[PDB]
Amino acid sequence: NSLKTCYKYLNQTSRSFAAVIQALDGEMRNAVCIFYLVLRALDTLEDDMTISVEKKVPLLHNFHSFLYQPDWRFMESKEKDRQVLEDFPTISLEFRNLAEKYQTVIADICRRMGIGMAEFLDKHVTSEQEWDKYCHYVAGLVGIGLSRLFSASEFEDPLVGEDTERANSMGLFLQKTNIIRDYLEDQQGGREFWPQEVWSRYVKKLGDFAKPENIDLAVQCLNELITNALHHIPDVITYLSRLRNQSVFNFCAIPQVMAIATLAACYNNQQVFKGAVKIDATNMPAVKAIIYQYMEEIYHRIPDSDPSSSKTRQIISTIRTQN
Numbered sequence: 001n002s003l004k005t006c007y008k009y010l011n012q013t014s015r016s017f018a019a020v021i022q023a024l025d026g027e028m029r030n031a032v033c034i035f036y037l038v039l040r041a042l043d044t045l046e047d048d049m050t051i052s053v054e055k056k057v058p059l060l061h062n063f064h065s066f067l068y069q070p071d072w073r074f075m076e077s078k079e080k081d082r083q084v085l086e087d088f089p090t091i092s093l094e095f096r097n098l099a100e101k102y103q104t105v106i107a108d109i110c111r112r113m114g115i116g117m118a119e120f121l122d123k124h125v126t127s128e129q130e131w132d133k134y135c136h137y138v139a140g141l142v143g144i145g146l147s148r149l150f151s152a153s154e155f156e157d158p159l160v161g162e163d164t165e166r167a168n169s170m171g172l173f174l175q176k177t178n179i180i181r182d183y184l185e186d187q188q189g190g191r192e193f194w195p196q197e198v199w200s201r202y203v204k205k206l207g208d209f210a211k212p213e214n215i216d217l218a219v220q221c222l223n224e225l226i227t228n229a230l231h232h233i234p235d236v237i238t239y240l241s242r243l244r245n246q247s248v249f250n251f252c253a254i255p256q257v258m259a260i261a262t263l264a265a266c267y268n269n270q271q272v273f274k275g276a277v278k279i280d281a282t283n284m285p286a287v288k289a290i291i292y293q294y295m296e297e298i299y300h301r302i303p304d305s306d307p308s309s310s311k312t313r314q315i316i317s318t319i320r321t322q323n
Protein backbone atom coordinates (compact mmCIF):
# COMPACT_ATOMS: atom_id res chain seq x y z
CA ASN A 1 0.00 0.00 0.00
CA SER A 2 3.10 2.19 0.32
CA LEU A 3 3.75 2.29 -3.42
CA LYS A 4 0.15 3.43 -3.84
CA THR A 5 0.75 6.19 -1.32
CA CYS A 6 3.88 7.17 -3.24
CA TYR A 7 1.84 7.45 -6.45
CA LYS A 8 -0.78 9.52 -4.67
CA TYR A 9 1.91 11.97 -3.50
CA LEU A 10 3.45 12.07 -6.95
CA ASN A 11 0.13 13.20 -8.38
CA GLN A 12 -0.21 15.62 -5.46
CA THR A 13 3.18 17.19 -6.11
CA SER A 14 2.80 17.08 -9.88
CA ARG A 15 -0.03 18.76 -11.75
CA SER A 16 0.50 17.08 -15.12
CA PHE A 17 3.90 15.42 -15.20
CA ALA A 18 2.81 12.46 -13.02
CA ALA A 19 0.98 11.01 -16.04
CA VAL A 20 4.22 11.11 -18.02
CA ILE A 21 6.25 9.44 -15.24
CA GLN A 22 3.66 6.70 -14.75
CA ALA A 23 3.99 6.09 -18.51
CA LEU A 24 7.66 5.06 -18.17
CA ASP A 25 8.66 1.50 -19.18
CA GLY A 26 9.43 -1.24 -16.71
CA GLU A 27 11.63 -0.44 -13.73
CA MET A 28 12.06 3.20 -14.75
CA ARG A 29 8.53 3.90 -13.58
CA ASN A 30 8.93 3.14 -9.86
CA ALA A 31 12.58 4.25 -9.98
CA VAL A 32 11.68 7.66 -11.43
CA CYS A 33 8.55 7.97 -9.26
CA ILE A 34 10.64 7.57 -6.13
CA PHE A 35 13.45 9.76 -7.50
CA TYR A 36 11.00 12.61 -8.12
CA LEU A 37 9.45 12.33 -4.64
CA VAL A 38 12.84 12.21 -2.88
CA LEU A 39 14.07 15.20 -4.91
CA ARG A 40 10.82 16.93 -4.01
CA ALA A 41 11.37 16.43 -0.28
CA LEU A 42 14.89 17.91 -0.44
CA ASP A 43 13.62 20.76 -2.60
CA THR A 44 10.86 21.51 -0.10
CA LEU A 45 13.50 21.76 2.62
CA GLU A 46 15.77 24.10 0.67
CA ASP A 47 12.86 26.35 -0.21
CA ASP A 48 11.52 26.50 3.32
CA MET A 49 12.54 29.93 4.53
CA THR A 50 10.72 29.40 7.82
CA ILE A 51 13.67 27.13 8.62
CA SER A 52 16.92 28.83 9.64
CA VAL A 53 20.16 28.12 7.76
CA GLU A 54 21.48 26.71 11.05
CA LYS A 55 18.88 23.93 10.96
CA LYS A 56 18.89 23.46 7.17
CA VAL A 57 22.61 22.84 6.64
CA PRO A 58 22.70 19.49 8.53
CA LEU A 59 19.34 18.55 6.99
CA LEU A 60 20.49 19.26 3.43
CA HIS A 61 23.80 17.52 4.10
CA ASN A 62 22.36 14.40 5.75
CA PHE A 63 19.41 13.93 3.40
CA HIS A 64 21.10 11.06 1.54
CA SER A 65 21.55 9.16 4.82
CA PHE A 66 17.87 9.84 5.66
CA LEU A 67 16.95 7.52 2.77
CA TYR A 68 18.36 4.71 4.90
CA GLN A 69 16.77 5.87 8.17
CA PRO A 70 13.38 4.01 8.22
CA ASP A 71 11.83 6.35 10.79
CA TRP A 72 13.24 9.71 9.66
CA ARG A 73 10.63 12.33 8.85
CA PHE A 74 10.39 16.12 9.07
CA MET A 75 7.38 17.63 10.84
CA GLU A 76 8.29 21.32 10.92
CA SER A 77 7.84 22.20 7.25
CA LYS A 78 5.27 24.92 6.62
CA GLU A 79 5.58 24.41 2.87
CA LYS A 80 2.99 23.35 0.30
CA ASP A 81 4.42 19.84 -0.09
CA ARG A 82 4.72 19.07 3.63
CA GLN A 83 3.37 15.51 3.42
CA VAL A 84 6.35 14.32 1.39
CA LEU A 85 8.54 15.20 4.42
CA GLU A 86 6.04 14.23 7.09
CA ASP A 87 5.51 10.77 5.62
CA PHE A 88 9.04 10.34 4.31
CA PRO A 89 9.40 6.84 5.79
CA THR A 90 6.86 5.64 3.21
CA ILE A 91 8.96 7.06 0.40
CA SER A 92 12.25 5.80 1.85
CA LEU A 93 10.67 2.38 2.27
CA GLU A 94 9.92 2.21 -1.45
CA PHE A 95 13.36 3.70 -2.18
CA ARG A 96 14.98 0.75 -0.39
CA ASN A 97 12.77 -1.58 -2.47
CA LEU A 98 14.33 -0.28 -5.67
CA ALA A 99 17.07 -2.31 -7.33
CA GLU A 100 20.40 -1.50 -5.70
CA LYS A 101 21.77 -0.26 -9.05
CA TYR A 102 19.13 2.48 -8.90
CA GLN A 103 19.60 3.23 -5.19
CA THR A 104 23.33 3.77 -5.79
CA VAL A 105 22.52 6.43 -8.39
CA ILE A 106 19.79 8.24 -6.42
CA ALA A 107 21.77 8.33 -3.14
CA ASP A 108 24.82 9.80 -4.87
CA ILE A 109 22.83 12.63 -6.47
CA CYS A 110 21.11 13.42 -3.16
CA ARG A 111 24.41 13.62 -1.28
CA ARG A 112 26.00 15.82 -3.92
CA MET A 113 22.86 17.93 -4.20
CA GLY A 114 22.77 18.37 -0.42
CA ILE A 115 26.34 19.68 -0.30
CA GLY A 116 25.33 21.98 -3.16
CA MET A 117 22.13 23.32 -1.58
CA ALA A 118 24.02 24.16 1.63
CA GLU A 119 26.85 25.79 -0.30
CA PHE A 120 24.50 28.33 -1.92
CA LEU A 121 22.06 28.71 0.97
CA ASP A 122 23.81 31.64 2.68
CA LYS A 123 25.73 33.15 -0.22
CA HIS A 124 24.89 35.08 -3.37
CA VAL A 125 25.04 33.41 -6.75
CA THR A 126 27.81 35.69 -8.02
CA SER A 127 29.13 35.02 -11.52
CA GLU A 128 27.22 33.37 -14.35
CA GLN A 129 29.72 30.55 -13.78
CA GLU A 130 28.40 30.23 -10.24
CA TRP A 131 24.86 30.26 -11.62
CA ASP A 132 25.77 27.19 -13.67
CA LYS A 133 27.31 25.75 -10.52
CA TYR A 134 24.08 26.17 -8.52
CA CYS A 135 21.93 24.97 -11.43
CA HIS A 136 24.22 21.98 -11.78
CA TYR A 137 23.70 21.12 -8.10
CA VAL A 138 19.90 21.24 -8.17
CA ALA A 139 18.98 20.32 -11.74
CA GLY A 140 22.11 19.28 -13.61
CA LEU A 141 22.68 16.41 -11.19
CA VAL A 142 19.04 15.42 -11.68
CA GLY A 143 19.76 15.08 -15.40
CA ILE A 144 22.90 13.12 -14.58
CA GLY A 145 20.93 10.90 -12.22
CA LEU A 146 18.08 10.23 -14.62
CA SER A 147 20.53 9.49 -17.44
CA ARG A 148 22.31 6.95 -15.26
CA LEU A 149 18.99 5.35 -14.28
CA PHE A 150 18.03 5.10 -17.95
CA SER A 151 21.24 3.25 -18.78
CA ALA A 152 21.01 1.04 -15.68
CA SER A 153 17.58 -0.21 -16.75
CA GLU A 154 19.05 -0.80 -20.20
CA PHE A 155 16.15 0.93 -21.94
CA GLU A 156 18.77 3.44 -23.00
CA ASP A 157 22.30 2.91 -24.32
CA PRO A 158 25.18 3.18 -21.80
CA LEU A 159 26.25 6.35 -23.63
CA VAL A 160 23.28 8.22 -22.14
CA GLY A 161 24.58 7.83 -18.60
CA GLU A 162 28.14 8.55 -19.71
CA ASP A 163 27.66 11.99 -21.25
CA THR A 164 27.27 13.96 -18.01
CA GLU A 165 27.93 17.17 -19.93
CA ARG A 166 24.80 16.59 -22.04
CA ALA A 167 22.65 15.43 -19.12
CA ASN A 168 23.83 18.43 -17.10
CA SER A 169 22.88 20.91 -19.85
CA MET A 170 19.37 19.44 -19.89
CA GLY A 171 19.08 20.31 -16.19
CA LEU A 172 20.61 23.78 -16.49
CA PHE A 173 18.15 24.66 -19.22
CA LEU A 174 15.11 23.80 -17.12
CA GLN A 175 16.50 25.29 -13.90
CA LYS A 176 17.45 28.63 -15.38
CA THR A 177 14.10 29.10 -17.13
CA ASN A 178 12.36 28.40 -13.78
CA ILE A 179 14.61 30.81 -11.84
CA ILE A 180 13.96 33.46 -14.49
CA ARG A 181 10.18 32.85 -14.59
CA ASP A 182 9.85 32.57 -10.81
CA TYR A 183 11.64 35.84 -9.91
CA LEU A 184 8.64 37.51 -8.16
CA GLU A 185 7.48 34.33 -6.45
CA ASP A 186 10.99 33.86 -5.03
CA GLN A 187 11.26 37.51 -3.91
CA GLN A 188 7.96 37.09 -2.12
CA GLY A 189 9.25 33.83 -0.68
CA GLY A 190 12.50 35.41 0.47
CA ARG A 191 14.65 33.60 -2.10
CA GLU A 192 17.19 35.00 -4.54
CA PHE A 193 18.95 33.04 -7.28
CA TRP A 194 19.75 35.54 -10.05
CA PRO A 195 23.52 36.11 -10.67
CA GLN A 196 24.74 39.19 -8.81
CA GLU A 197 27.44 39.98 -11.38
CA VAL A 198 24.59 40.36 -13.87
CA TRP A 199 21.94 42.14 -11.78
CA SER A 200 24.38 44.52 -10.02
CA ARG A 201 25.02 46.04 -13.45
CA TYR A 202 21.37 47.09 -13.68
CA VAL A 203 20.13 47.68 -10.19
CA LYS A 204 21.23 48.12 -6.54
CA LYS A 205 19.45 45.12 -4.97
CA LEU A 206 17.86 42.15 -6.77
CA GLY A 207 14.53 43.05 -5.18
CA ASP A 208 14.61 46.37 -7.02
CA PHE A 209 13.27 44.62 -10.14
CA ALA A 210 10.01 44.10 -8.25
CA LYS A 211 9.71 47.91 -7.93
CA PRO A 212 7.65 49.49 -10.80
CA GLU A 213 10.03 52.36 -11.48
CA ASN A 214 12.78 49.91 -12.44
CA ILE A 215 10.86 47.94 -15.07
CA ASP A 216 13.09 48.94 -18.03
CA LEU A 217 16.29 47.74 -16.32
CA ALA A 218 14.43 44.66 -15.10
CA VAL A 219 13.51 43.68 -18.66
CA GLN A 220 17.04 44.24 -19.99
CA CYS A 221 18.51 41.95 -17.28
CA LEU A 222 15.71 39.47 -17.92
CA ASN A 223 16.63 39.47 -21.61
CA GLU A 224 20.29 38.93 -20.77
CA LEU A 225 19.53 35.93 -18.53
CA ILE A 226 17.33 34.35 -21.19
CA THR A 227 20.08 34.77 -23.81
CA ASN A 228 22.35 33.02 -21.32
CA ALA A 229 19.81 30.18 -21.10
CA LEU A 230 19.50 29.68 -24.86
CA HIS A 231 23.10 28.46 -24.94
CA HIS A 232 22.01 25.05 -23.65
CA ILE A 233 19.69 24.33 -26.60
CA PRO A 234 22.33 22.55 -28.74
CA ASP A 235 23.14 20.15 -25.91
CA VAL A 236 19.42 19.59 -25.25
CA ILE A 237 18.88 18.72 -28.94
CA THR A 238 21.94 16.44 -28.83
CA TYR A 239 20.80 14.69 -25.65
CA LEU A 240 17.28 14.19 -26.99
CA SER A 241 18.43 12.93 -30.40
CA ARG A 242 20.27 10.02 -28.75
CA LEU A 243 17.26 8.61 -26.86
CA ARG A 244 15.87 5.32 -28.16
CA ASN A 245 13.08 4.46 -25.73
CA GLN A 246 9.74 6.15 -26.52
CA SER A 247 8.53 6.59 -22.93
CA VAL A 248 11.95 8.06 -22.04
CA PHE A 249 11.83 10.42 -25.01
CA ASN A 250 8.39 11.79 -24.05
CA PHE A 251 9.59 12.02 -20.46
CA CYS A 252 12.61 14.17 -21.36
CA ALA A 253 11.25 16.10 -24.34
CA ILE A 254 8.11 17.43 -22.68
CA PRO A 255 9.84 19.59 -20.02
CA GLN A 256 12.42 20.91 -22.53
CA VAL A 257 9.66 22.00 -24.93
CA MET A 258 7.65 23.58 -22.11
CA ALA A 259 10.82 25.36 -21.01
CA ILE A 260 11.56 26.99 -24.37
CA ALA A 261 7.87 27.93 -24.60
CA THR A 262 8.23 29.63 -21.22
CA LEU A 263 11.40 31.50 -22.24
CA ALA A 264 9.63 32.61 -25.42
CA ALA A 265 6.71 33.91 -23.37
CA CYS A 266 8.94 35.61 -20.78
CA TYR A 267 11.33 37.23 -23.27
CA ASN A 268 11.22 41.05 -23.11
CA ASN A 269 8.04 40.62 -21.09
CA GLN A 270 7.44 43.17 -18.34
CA GLN A 271 4.78 40.89 -16.81
CA VAL A 272 7.55 38.65 -15.48
CA PHE A 273 8.08 41.21 -12.71
CA LYS A 274 4.41 41.78 -11.89
CA GLY A 275 3.43 38.13 -11.62
CA ALA A 276 3.39 34.68 -13.21
CA VAL A 277 3.34 34.75 -17.03
CA LYS A 278 0.79 32.58 -18.87
CA ILE A 279 1.94 30.66 -21.95
CA ASP A 280 3.75 16.83 -30.96
CA ALA A 281 6.84 16.29 -28.79
CA THR A 282 6.90 12.55 -29.61
CA ASN A 283 9.63 12.37 -32.29
CA MET A 284 12.96 14.21 -32.66
CA PRO A 285 12.20 15.97 -35.99
CA ALA A 286 8.95 17.35 -34.55
CA VAL A 287 10.70 18.39 -31.31
CA LYS A 288 13.39 20.24 -33.30
CA ALA A 289 10.73 22.08 -35.30
CA ILE A 290 8.90 23.05 -32.09
CA ILE A 291 12.13 24.40 -30.58
CA TYR A 292 13.06 26.24 -33.78
CA GLN A 293 9.67 27.91 -34.04
CA TYR A 294 9.94 29.16 -30.44
CA MET A 295 13.48 30.47 -31.07
CA GLU A 296 12.05 32.54 -33.92
CA GLU A 297 9.34 33.94 -31.67
CA ILE A 298 12.12 35.27 -29.42
CA TYR A 299 14.19 36.46 -32.37
CA HIS A 300 11.41 38.61 -33.82
CA ARG A 301 10.96 40.25 -30.43
CA ILE A 302 14.61 41.26 -30.12
CA PRO A 303 14.67 45.04 -29.41
CA ASP A 304 17.58 46.44 -31.43
CA SER A 305 18.26 48.76 -28.47
CA ASP A 306 18.51 45.94 -25.92
CA PRO A 307 22.01 45.60 -24.37
CA SER A 308 21.98 41.93 -25.38
CA SER A 309 20.45 42.27 -28.88
CA SER A 310 23.58 41.11 -30.69
CA LYS A 311 24.17 38.24 -28.25
CA THR A 312 20.59 36.94 -28.45
CA ARG A 313 20.72 37.09 -32.25
CA GLN A 314 24.02 35.24 -32.42
CA ILE A 315 23.00 32.29 -30.24
CA ILE A 316 19.80 32.04 -32.26
CA SER A 317 21.75 31.99 -35.54
CA THR A 318 23.92 29.28 -34.02
CA ILE A 319 20.90 27.12 -33.11
CA ARG A 320 19.44 27.82 -36.58
CA THR A 321 22.43 26.64 -38.59
CA GLN A 322 23.74 23.88 -36.34
CA ASN A 323 22.19 20.43 -35.76
Ligand SMILES: CC(C)(C)CN1C(=O)[C@@H](CC(=O)N[C@@H](CC(=O)O)C(=O)O)O[C@H](c2cccc3ccccc23)c2cc(Cl)ccc21
Pocket residue numbers: 013014015016017032035036039138139140142143144146167170171172174175251252255258
Ligand atom coordinates in the same frame (compact mmCIF):
# COMPACT_ATOMS: atom_id res chain seq x y z
C1 LIG B 1 14.23 21.44 -10.63
C2 LIG B 1 13.86 20.43 -11.76
C3 LIG B 1 13.95 21.17 -13.13
C4 LIG B 1 14.94 19.29 -11.77
C5 LIG B 1 12.43 19.84 -11.54
N1 LIG B 1 11.91 18.83 -12.47
C6 LIG B 1 11.09 19.22 -13.51
O1 LIG B 1 10.94 20.39 -13.85
C7 LIG B 1 10.34 18.15 -14.30
C8 LIG B 1 9.12 18.72 -15.07
C9 LIG B 1 7.93 19.01 -14.19
O2 LIG B 1 7.64 18.23 -13.30
N2 LIG B 1 7.23 20.15 -14.42
C10 LIG B 1 6.08 20.48 -13.59
C11 LIG B 1 6.24 21.84 -12.85
C12 LIG B 1 4.94 22.27 -12.20
O3 LIG B 1 4.41 21.62 -11.31
O4 LIG B 1 4.41 23.42 -12.66
C13 LIG B 1 4.82 20.52 -14.43
O5 LIG B 1 3.80 19.96 -14.03
O6 LIG B 1 4.83 21.19 -15.60
O7 LIG B 1 11.20 17.47 -15.24
C14 LIG B 1 12.53 17.20 -14.75
C15 LIG B 1 13.36 16.42 -15.78
C16 LIG B 1 12.74 15.48 -16.64
C17 LIG B 1 13.49 14.80 -17.61
C18 LIG B 1 14.88 15.05 -17.73
C19 LIG B 1 15.51 15.99 -16.88
C20 LIG B 1 16.88 16.26 -17.03
C21 LIG B 1 17.50 17.21 -16.20
C22 LIG B 1 16.76 17.88 -15.22
C23 LIG B 1 15.39 17.61 -15.07
C24 LIG B 1 14.75 16.67 -15.90
C25 LIG B 1 12.48 16.60 -13.33
C26 LIG B 1 12.72 15.23 -13.12
C27 LIG B 1 12.67 14.70 -11.82
CL1 LIG B 1 12.94 13.01 -11.54
C28 LIG B 1 12.40 15.55 -10.73
C29 LIG B 1 12.15 16.91 -10.93
C30 LIG B 1 12.18 17.44 -12.23
